[PDB]
A paper describes a structure:
Voltage-activated potassium (Kv) channels open in response to membrane depolarization to conduct K+ ions, a process that is critical for electrical signaling in neurons and endocrine cells, as well as muscle contraction. Kv channels contain voltage-sensing domains that activate with membrane depolarization, and a central pore domain that opens to conduct K+ ions with high selectivity. The X-ray crystal structure of Kv1.2, a mammalian homolog of the Shaker Kv channel, and those of the Kv1.2–2.1 chimera containing the S3b-S4 paddle motif from Kv2.1 (Kv chimera), serve as a structural framework for understanding the gating mechanism of Kv channels. Since no structure has been obtained for a voltage-activated ion channel in a membrane environment, in the present study we solved the structure of the Kv chimera reconstituted in a lipid nanodisc environment using single-particle cryo-electron microscopy (cryo-EM).
To obtain maps with a higher local resolution, we performed particle subtraction, followed by additional classifications as well as 3D refinement on the cytosolic and transmembrane domain independently. The additional two maps showed higher resolution for each domain (3 Å for the cytosolic domain with local higher resolution as high as ~2.5 Å, and ~4 Å for the transmembrane region with local higher resolution of up to ~3.0 Å), which we used to build models of the Kv channel. Although the transmembrane domain exhibits overall lower resolution than the cytosolic domain, we see cryo-EM densities for all transmembrane helices (S1-S6) with densities visible for many of the bulky side chains, which enabled us to refine a model for the entire complex. In addition, the central pore domain shows higher local resolutions (3–4 Å) compared to the peripheral voltage-sensing domains (resolutions of ~4–6 Å), with the lowest resolution for the peripheral loops in the latter domain. Overall, the transmembrane domain only shows minimal structural differences when compared to the crystal structure, suggesting that the X-ray structure is representative of the structure of the protein in a membrane environment. For the intracellular end of the pore where the activation gate resides, we observed no discernable structural differences between the cryo-EM and X-ray structures. Within the external pore region that has been implicated in C-type inactivation, we see no evidence for significant constriction or dilation of the pore. In our structure of the Kv chimera, sidechain density for D375 (equivalent to D447 in Shaker) is weak compared to other nearby residues, including W362, Y373, M376 and V377, raising the possibility that the critical hydrogen bond between D375 in the P-loop and W362 in the pore helix may be broken.
Author numbering:
A (entry chain F), B (entry chain H), C (entry chain B), D (entry chain D): 120 to 417
Write the structure that this text describes.
């Protein structure tokens, strides 16, 4: 049994996964209801629920921004900014105990599900200390927080001049809601394969960014000086032209700004070729890993 | 003979195709005239006809939309909308027993060929009940339908206020004519290989769309809030910015809308790289299958 | 010696190249001076000359079009059209026995080299009948012809009303000069490998064009009807939208015309993905051949 | 020991690296402090310093161009040109013994490090003659020079009418500062793998450029004549259209100029496909080498 384990690790057939139960025999049993969808029919249903749950939050998150509805705000004409209208304009919902804001309800509804997932999952974990080394528990935590950041801003604060301390910092938090989408990782097998391919390429991915950081700087400058002697130049500075080379090394290619001089085109056309020769060097490094981690289940 | 068949299936040399005739001995014989082009010279000719047939419909379909001819319509100046002018403007041809509309003739001509293909092929099929599991018979059916839907709209309807019930539903049908192009599958060997490669990738293709659906939502939002505090922003909402990230993860890159702020470019430039790292993960999954299904004839 | 040749052909080590000399013993000897650069120092020199010759013609061809010089034409203001100014405006040079046009000299100089290559190569060929099956002799012929087509229009014609018979047909010929660039094939080893890779892919390349021809039609139509109900639509017809889908299946992506409606974007964004899934299916079919034909010299 | 070395070279396990010390025993000992970071803690620190050094110069180089600061120049309004304001406008810093220009200090500070790297590295080299064959010493030299070219222009010249001799030649030098970024090659292992992959591809890379040079010329001309008979054409000449085909063979795709005629689109759409069939032929030639040179450390 000892030289067989050294054989499979060389082979890579290393599956040491053994889910220990919580030992309560119902603290154990209910734990497996929320750790394994394959134990029963209703065990699937929880996954069937929670996968659908995340989508409901997202559509509710995206529709707040819609100008059928953000133009149907408290500032439907958009004249000033109030302390209570800051929530309708920079938090995207109207907090009220009456809760006439429909989205503010729908936002809140999923959070009740997420904690009752998570907290019940926290109380029934066998491994208590190493709970926060698991990455698929971290996303659970970061999801539920700007909910509470919203409320403590509303409940605790009864004062003036709070926007001069932190107001766009609140607007940062309105983004960071967006990484609730990573909660699908617990359900998709395939999204974890991305999560492992990146985990197995964190140095070779750094070959890409560093080779692009070289490519950006070299050709942003070299086009800036060939487009230098215009009064009418589209390239005012070199950190303007960092936007230009990533538009043209990644071959997206926009048209917002394009070189105009005879030299700036000759410079500009090398950068089109060299972006192929910068992305494609460490891409098949990655994709061979992803192909390997995909069929590694077989 | 028993352990040889288990050998070839492991190998993949599994060709169990055996075309049974219809047994009529002319019901059988004429069936093979319209199932196999290789039985005779004229057996090729039917395929040589029917391949040329489909093209004639397409050019006749596309030229209806041309403003040498849709501007040479009954509303050549475009003032109003009549019940009979709905056919020339939303069905694309003028139905008449005189049939002065030339395209309306040419459209009708191919349909006579298609049924006389199909209906004769229906009566001479050996497999009678399993006729509608064959996908290359489904396209035959979907081709001939909006022809009849056009006529029943003309024949049965003599009444007022029909556009308030279904008029854009008619305009849907004018699209669905377009999938007559898939009828070439019966003739091209290579188009069926695409039909099989997709048939062997319907989960791994779903890795692509789901990894892109992740990529779209994450960066559409993250550019929306870095482009937030403009009165002059090109990004009014987040479902506006779903158009933006598929223009920029697929590296098409249009120029209709591009970020402008300092933050929106830094967000916007990550999304150029990440679209490479989203398409290219399950593409060589597919292309290895297609290369495998191509030479599988050898 | 017989089962060794069957071995190498299976292997692919099939090099039956045996250059028979012209047998004149100076017709033979001068032949190797103009077929093999490796026989001597001066044998290289002709190859060094003729490679430099082609470039001289090209720069002379491209500079005619330059508006430092085509605006310095006989119609420097561009008011009318003369029969003698047709050469300076649609043949790009001024033919005269004085030949004051400098480019018209430089154009003429190279043709003297090409024939004295070719005609001397014609008279000293061992194989006289199969001379015109060799493709690298066809390019020799097609190069020298529109030179003579230029002169016969000048020399033979002294009459009126020739532009109503053929005038843009002359302008066709001014293009077809451009395939003089393929004359480098006799000199580059690498350009012939492209010439062989295409020669070994003429069916599998046809998988690409036909899969793209499917992709173009299916999405040009499907965006035309989602962009139909505008008075302000960017898509007037469907053969307008053939330009649109090759801008967007090949992911070039211009911005001349982009969909605007909610449906036209959803249609338009599928076509971005599907162009990856159309180019990349028969590309590694080709590139595996090119990699094979490249190192086939080793 | 003799047939083992012939074995490893076939294998490619050829590591003949033997760093001979300078033999001074402190000239030797200090040499390893500036050639090997792995000898000690402080040996790392010099590499930790000098990697951070280069970045400081770059940010200082890029920020000079910023119109928070180049508009805060001596010509903050930009009316004329002085002999002393040429440094603030075309050398990017204000040279003085007072040195009130802050960047001109920060520029100067890094050069003191680079020479004290290099000159100390020069005096302690074992190999003195072949010092300038090593490429990672050339980059050291070309870095430090336009610093001195700046000073000798200021120190030696006290005269008039120097701009009519060389003024944009000075502006050339302001670019050539930019290749100080290649100094990271001594530190990154991965950037040298790029440096070796290009060193192992200098003929096969030339397959790419020459196949593109063919592709550019053939389609720039062929679109010029299909877009010829406009008064309103976007393509004035053929070397205008060299910018067009590299925008469209590399599939960047800008929108600055796009064909408009019916023929110019049919020409223009072939060039989209053919740029895929020109980049992708010698790319996996390269990327296989880079993948090989990456893991060649293992």
């Amino acid at each position: 049994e000892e030289a067989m384990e050294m054989f499979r690790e060389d082979e890579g057939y290393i599956k040491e996964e053994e889910r220990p139960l919580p030992e309560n025999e119902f603290q154990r049993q209910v734990w497996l209801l929320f750790e394994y969808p394959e134990s029963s029919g209703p065990a699937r249903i929880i996954a069937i629920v929670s996968v659908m749950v995340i989508l409901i939050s997202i559509v509710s998150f995206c529709l707040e921004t819609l100008p059928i509805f953000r133009d149907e705000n408290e500032d439907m004409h958009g004249g000033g900014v109030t302390f209570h209208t800051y929530s309708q304009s920079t938090i995207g919902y109207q907090q009220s105990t009456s809760f006439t804001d429909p989205f503010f309800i729908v936002e809140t509804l999923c959070i009740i599900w997420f904690s009752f997932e998570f907290l019940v999952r926290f109380f029934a974990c066998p491994s208590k200390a190493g709970f926060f080394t698991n990455i698929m528990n971290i996303i659970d935590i970061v999801a539920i927080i700007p909910y509470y950041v919203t409320i403590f801003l509303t409940e605790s604060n009864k004062s003036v001049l709070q926007f001069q301390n932190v107001r766009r910092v609140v607007q940062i938090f309105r983004i960071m809601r967006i990484l609730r989408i990573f909660k699908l990782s617990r359900h998709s097998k395939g999204l974890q394969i991305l999560g492992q391919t990146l985990k197995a390429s964190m140095r070779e991915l750094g070959l890409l960014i560093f080779f692009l950081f070289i490519g950006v700087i070299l050709f942003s400058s070299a086009v800036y000086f060939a487009e230098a002697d215009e009064r009418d130049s589209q390239f005012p500075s070199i950190p303007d032209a960092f936007w230009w080379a990533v538009v043209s090394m990644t071959t997206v290619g926009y048209g917002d700004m394009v070189p105009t001089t005879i030299g700036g085109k000759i410079v500009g056309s090398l950068c089109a070729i060299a972006g192929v020769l910068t992305i494609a060097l460490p891409v098949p490094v990655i994709v061979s890993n992803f192909n390997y981690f995909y069929h590694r289940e077989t």
